[PDB]
Design an enzyme around this catalytic site. Sequence first.
Site, PDB file in Angstrom:
ATOM      1  CB  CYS C  37      32.780  38.200  37.534  1.00  0.00           C
ATOM      2  SG  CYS C  37      32.221  36.491  37.407  1.00  0.00           S
ATOM      3  CB  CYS C  40      30.025  38.925  40.673  1.00  0.00           C
ATOM      4  SG  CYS C  40      31.443  37.807  40.787  1.00  0.00           S
TER       5      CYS C  40
END
EC number: 1.8.-.-
Lengths: 384, 104, 114, 42, 49
Positions: C37, C40
């Site tokens: 992700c 993140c």
Amino acid sequence: VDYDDGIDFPYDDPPLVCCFGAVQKEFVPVVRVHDNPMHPDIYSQWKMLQWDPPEFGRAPGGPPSNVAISHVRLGGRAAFMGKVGGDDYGEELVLMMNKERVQTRGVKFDEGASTACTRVKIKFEDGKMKAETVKEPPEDSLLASELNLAVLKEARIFHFNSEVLTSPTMESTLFKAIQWSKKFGGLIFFDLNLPLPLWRSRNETRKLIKKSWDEANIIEVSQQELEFLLDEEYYERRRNYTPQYFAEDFEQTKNRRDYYHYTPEEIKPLWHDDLKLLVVTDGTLRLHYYTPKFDGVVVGTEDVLITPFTCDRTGSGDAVVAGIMRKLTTCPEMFEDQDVLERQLRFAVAAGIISQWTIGAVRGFPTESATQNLKEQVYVPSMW
Amino acid sequence: MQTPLEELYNVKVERKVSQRRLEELGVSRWSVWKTGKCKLPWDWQVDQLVYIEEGEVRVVPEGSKRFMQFLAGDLVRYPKWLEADLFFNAPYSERYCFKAYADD
Amino acid sequence: FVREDYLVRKLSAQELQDLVKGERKVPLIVDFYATWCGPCILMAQELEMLAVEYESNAMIVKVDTDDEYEFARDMQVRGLPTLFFISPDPSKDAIRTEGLIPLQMMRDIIDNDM
Amino acid sequence: RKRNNPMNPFYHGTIRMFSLLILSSSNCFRIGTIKNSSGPLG
Amino acid sequence: AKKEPYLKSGQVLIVQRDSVVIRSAKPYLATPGAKVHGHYREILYEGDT
């Protein structure tokens, strides 16, 4: 429900679009399990998953405010309908949308709530930790009486994601907004973008989305979402099949990537009367489109390896949807002309490609002239 | 595979031997071999007739993932040139006789 | 002899279970992340800075959703990045946040609500 | 010999040889009285 | 035939009633005086002269 709202006006061009849901910074909703994790601490390695992504993350979508911002940068006009708290983070989200020239008259403030904050209680049922919601955040608490009907009267496309189906309050509010939009002639755009809970089981998700699926005139789903909704194992088996002795044709010998185009009979369980256009996205690589009269695929491409240190796929799904909405409002023959539809969808492909070249979704959303430039550079002139 | 190990390796077995057959073979004069829980590799250089009196043995031919199981009361003929591993898990007792060409 | 480069600890669901059931004195901040992700990466750097700011006045941990997917869903994680702010007072309820929130907003939650 | 030894049962492609090559779908592809019946005569 | 798609290069491996299986092959044009490196049916790996 009863009457109209506002004063009728000549309604400046380009036609307005309304995005309904939660305004969040980043926040990728589509979460599944990937089998190729990088180092848990050294995040400098994590960019290697941006250029070899999980299939569900090839062109990720995001919050509806991403689509509104991306739509405006592509030359359109958009308004956001939703609620934020009266705190400082709420002002920052609204100031972000005002800077991007998104209308925020449809944004309601809740002075008693904290933006993007959910109160939950932690329980220990059957030896396992679980949480349950005590108080929903302001983002998921817009009421029907708080809808801005002037926006719903003016807007020609009403756009929402399936994240609003995870909130009891938003779901009731959503179907009042759809009723108003349809009464005023707006088209309903359902951009699925399934959040983490809705990936648990096909049958529960199909029941949960069926009502909103039936109200939509335009639907965008990813290839992973479509296969999950129909039959995940059948299509995985289909991709993994290899003839035992010889290929059925010369192309099957090349062992190329699978770009299977679903037949309209496979799609039939999901088709309904009011559906005008279904788009299935394989990232930016393929855009399968389905209409009541015809179907086909637009061939696209991607190049994140051209910029390995700034590539970030987050938000590229929103740029593709915004590009579709930009062309649908200004080129209404897209619904009935196949050649026109394919040419206009190549504009959406180009917008998705550029969006993957920058870290951060909002930071990297492309302008109209950049998108038009890339489209003419990538495609031969006869395809423009 | 589908074919049993006994058929593949030509291991003749006569489970539940009658006393008549034992006396025809003269088993009462055969030598005795016994063992406990252990593992015996062997390559047969001549055919061997074995009458199991107690226990059981699991025979794993060289390179095999399956086994042949013989129990007390069975008369086994291990063929010449067989390479196998014999496994025992409990007290085992047998009477044996090695057979040259012709003979028996 | 060589100081470690990363302060935020990665915990299993079982390990996080005992940490919450056990007695705590400082606020507990739990980060759900995945290495695939993109956002993140940005959140990982903010939580490392938050760990430096709150040396022993807070405990910052992280959970990978690739390893603890079922646990994340039961915790009502709807997407990434997601933070849980758990008070040392067992009566107070935890706060779940979604999205790349500013560092100052994390500090206000810890100081005023934790 | 086996007795001298010093896991417990109780607990695509077509070969082309003449040198070996494998033939498969990666290099082969397709381009697209009573009534008499075939069978044994005895 | 006029009403048929053009063939691909290779050798006819299988003949059936209404189809043919082809083993893919690539021809190389060579002029007089050129030298072939290998006997007939010699295996040549990728990148070999």
